[PDB]
From Swiss-Prot, chain A:
This is V-type ATP synthase subunit D. Belongs to the V-ATPase D subunit family. Keywords: ATP synthesis, Hydrogen ion transport, Ion transport, Transport. The chain holds residues 2 to 168 of 223 of the full protein. One of its GO terms (molecular function) is proton-transporting ATP synthase activity, rotational mechanism. The keyword rRNA processing does not apply. The keyword Phosphoprotein does not apply. The gene is atpD. GO terms for biological process: proton motive force-driven plasma membrane ATP synthesis. Produces ATP from ADP in the presence of a proton gradient across the membrane.
UniProtKB/Swiss-Prot annotation, chain B:
This is V-type ATP synthase subunit F. Keywords: ATP synthesis, Hydrogen ion transport, Ion transport, Transport. The gene is atpF. Produces ATP from ADP in the presence of a proton gradient across the membrane. It comes from Thermus thermophilus (strain ATCC 27634 / DSM 579 / HB8). Pfam families: ATP-synt_F (PF01990). The lineage of its organism: Bacteria, Thermotogati, Deinococcota, Deinococci, Thermales. InterPro entries: ATPase_V1-cplx_f_g_su, ATPase_V1-cplx_fsu_bac/arc, ATPase_V1_fsu_sf. The keyword Ion transport applies. One of its GO terms (biological process) is proton motive force-driven plasma membrane ATP synthesis.
Swiss-Prot record, chains C, E:
Signal peptide: none annotated. This is V-type ATP synthase alpha chain. Belongs to the ATPase alpha/beta chains family. Produces ATP from ADP in the presence of a proton gradient across the membrane. The V-type alpha chain is a catalytic subunit. The chain holds residues 387 to 577 of 578 of the full protein.
From Swiss-Prot, chain D:
Belongs to the ATPase alpha/beta chains family. This is V-type ATP synthase beta chain. Produces ATP from ADP in the presence of a proton gradient across the membrane. The V-type beta chain is a regulatory subunit. The lineage of its organism: Bacteria, Thermotogati, Deinococcota, Deinococci, Thermales. It comes from Thermus thermophilus (strain ATCC 27634 / DSM 579 / HB8). The gene is atpB.
Length: 167, 100, 191, 104, 191
């Protein structure tokens, strides 16, 4: 098109250059903290998956005793008495960078009414599946935050590269 | 509030809330996953690793910026879980945003 | 001859003068008059007049003037990061500083030479407006520390009160200012 | 340029150049993390960064701002050591321990 | 006046001169004396001087020199992103390259000009040092290829043995060199 007028804009261009360099060397210092948090989160993810595997093996073992001692009225109560419950929680805690929707999840567990002389092996199976649900909640809690902070890392790195290469 | 796995464990999930929809109707599970997110009234859909639940290209295509149930690979079965930790570690690391 | 302060007359007329009121072009395109650039100008007399101010206007008028200048020329630095990133990735105190700076810039440094009563503002009236702005900023800082949100802090109608507080005449100001001051002090601890 | 030729044992004191180096480093650190804080928040900082921020602020408000005083060299060095004390040892990565001992 | 190699004086001196030695200040701030930036310097008297090297130093001197230059090039190209995730989350070959580059630029490329017996490194002495460093790199890659840890490599005593190489005199160096190569090749199989 047309370069701006050709004097007293030189001082302004040098000022803009100084500001762009300050911006690059500030974005770098922000990405440093982003990584210093990402590593702790990828550390916690391992323990989360560990507990999930533990509860999985537990409930799978305690469930195959309902295989051998298969209970007709037991699995009928598994059909008769069962609340389909929606603990659909969308709690948001931290918004890193700009406004970033974080998704938390809590567990509203029912009561599971049962007669007076109720117990059997299916009760232990159901409690094992409840612990299984707790661990599943933990994992689905952590992985979202991890992917969010990763996307933040990638965004800031793209900004740094675009600036320092094009502008 | 949902799962996609073999029927013996699907009914196991059904045992205490959290309806399970067995994999005997979708081994690829794309159809059942799409139907479950269509009904949408769920908080998460833990998909078994029958073939792969990782390519959520079309899933996030149908969502396109939604606070919908969170896709989460759960497991394939229980016979060995020794290296699955570092498997998830490497895969979640290199294939997601942060390089290498 | 082009607006540039590098002409021989524009340079030789420095180094010999006292104040220097550099006018800016963009402020004059926005129809923001007067278009006095608040960071290229300067004054050299502002240190021998303080006895006269203390004698004839107020007692902490130098301190109020210092606070106003410091707030402006600290908000400038934050505005740099604003233009770099965007005025939403900032914290709450930072956005409060930006918004107080804008309230100052549009309610205390603007003056229309064609109004009926906003064409001759005296020293007591200017000092009154400065007092109101400083008190509002102080209480808003306290409330932001408490935890209330900046959107509510901005929707507080004392904003528009102390904004239009400049179209008053010079007779009812000693009472208008008292009423608005007490109203601010009340309404910013009500919530 | 000719500073290192005018400070040292027999001229003013021993810790002169090292104190200067350390003050320079700490002030640069503080002046960077101030903008960092403005962008990110005091939520995601570390303790060393909090302490460097407070050091930088106190340096601007106590060592530069002096008015019409006449500070001798001993008084200036005392103020400098008092200001440097606000940091933990092991962060003073430019001073010698035989000096850190008698001062700080 | 500023330090930019684009003014007329420098633009002519370059393309009138041969070698060019880029003294840098950051390298001096990192205590790396002498401070000559190998990523910016360059020379043109290598090709037409090789024959003297073959006939008076040794027969593989060019290839040793080129291998060292490639080592440094790769160390820098890797260092490009090391500091991001810290020098611990890299595969063993990468950390080996980095440690070897550190050995190079901290015990061959650095000369305490105030010492007594370390100010004049002869051609044979420089050749010996390069030979030892390349031998250690070859044996460390031979170990890593089998699957030894990346911690015995760094805790060995041959590292210190070659670290004290340059501080030795110019009379005992042939014997020191023979013993050092024998000892490296020996002690790099037991672990």
């Amino acid at each position: 098109s047309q370069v701006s007028p050709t004097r007293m804009n030189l001082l302004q261009r040098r000022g803009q250059l100084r500001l762009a360099q300050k911006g690059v060397d500030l974005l770098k210092k922000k990405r440093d903290a982003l990584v210093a948090e990402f590593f702790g989160l990828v550390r916690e993810a391992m323990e989360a998956r560990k507990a999930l595997d533990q509860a999985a093996k537990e409930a799978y073992a305690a469930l195959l005793l309902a295989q051998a001692f298969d209970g007709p009225e037991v699995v009928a109560g598994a059909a008769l008495g069962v609340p389909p419950l929606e603990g659909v929680e969308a709690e948001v805690e931290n918004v890193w960078g700009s406004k970033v929707p974080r998704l938390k999840a809590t567990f509203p567990d029912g009561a599971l009414l049962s007669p007076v002389g109720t117990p059997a092996y299916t009760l232990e199976a159901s409690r094992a599946f409840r612990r299984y649900a707790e661990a599943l909640i933990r994992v689905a809690n952590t992985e979202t935050r991890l992917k969010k902070i990763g996307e933040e890392i990638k965004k800031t790195t793209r900004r740094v590269n675009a600036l320092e290469q094009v502008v | 509030m949902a799962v996609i796995a073999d029927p013996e464990t699907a009914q196991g999930f059904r045992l205490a809330g959290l309806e399970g929809y067995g994999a005997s109707s979708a081994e690829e599970a794309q159809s059942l996953l799409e139907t479950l997110v269509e009904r949408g009234g769920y908080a998460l859909v833990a998909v078994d690793e029958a073939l792969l639940p990782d390519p959520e290209r079309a899933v996030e295509r149908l969502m396109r910026g939604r606070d919908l149930p969170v896709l989460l690979p759960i497991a394939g079965l229980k016979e060995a879980f020794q290296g699955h930790d570092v498997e998830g570690y490497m895969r979640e690391l290199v294939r997601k945003t942060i390089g290498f | 001859p082009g607006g540039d302060m590098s002409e021989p007359v524009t340079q030789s007329t420095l180094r010999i003068v006292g104040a220097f009121w550099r006018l800016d072009a963009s402020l004059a395109f926005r129809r923001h008059f007067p278009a006095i650039n608040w960071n290229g100008s300067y004054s050299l007399f502002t240190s021998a007049l303080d006895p006269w101010y203390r004698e004839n206007v107020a007692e902490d008028y130098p301190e109020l003037r210092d606070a106003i200048s410091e707030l402006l020329q600290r908000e400038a630095g934050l505005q740099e990061i604003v233009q770099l990133v965007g005025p939403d990735a900032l914290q709450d105190a930072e956005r409060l500083v930006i918004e107080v700076g804008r309230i100052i810039r549009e309610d205390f440094l603007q003056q229309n030479a064609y109004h009926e009563v906003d064409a001759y503002c005296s020293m007591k009236k200017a000092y009154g407006i400065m007092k109101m702005i400083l008190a509002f900023y102080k209480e808003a800082e306290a409330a932001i520390k408490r935890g209330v949100s900046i959107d509510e802090i901005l929707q507080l109608p004392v904003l528009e009160r102390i904004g239009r507080a400049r179209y008053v005449s010079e007779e009812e100001f000693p009472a208008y200012f008292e009423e608005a001051m007490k109203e601010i002090q009340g309404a910013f601890k009500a919530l | 340029r000719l500073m290192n030729n005018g400070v040292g044992k027999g001229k003013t004191r021993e810790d002169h150049k090292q104190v200067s180096d350390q003050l320079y480093s700490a002030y640069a650190n503080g002046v960077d993390i101030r903008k960092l804080v403005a962008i990110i928040g005091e939520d995601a900082l570390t303790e060393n960064d909090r302490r460097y921020l407070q050091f930088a602020d106190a340096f601007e408000r106590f060592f530069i701002n002096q008015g019409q005083q006449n500070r001798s060299i001993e008084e200036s060095l005392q103020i400098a050591w008092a200001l440097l004390s606000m940091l933990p040892q092991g962060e003073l990565k430019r001073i010698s321990k035989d000096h850190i001992g008698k001062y700080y």
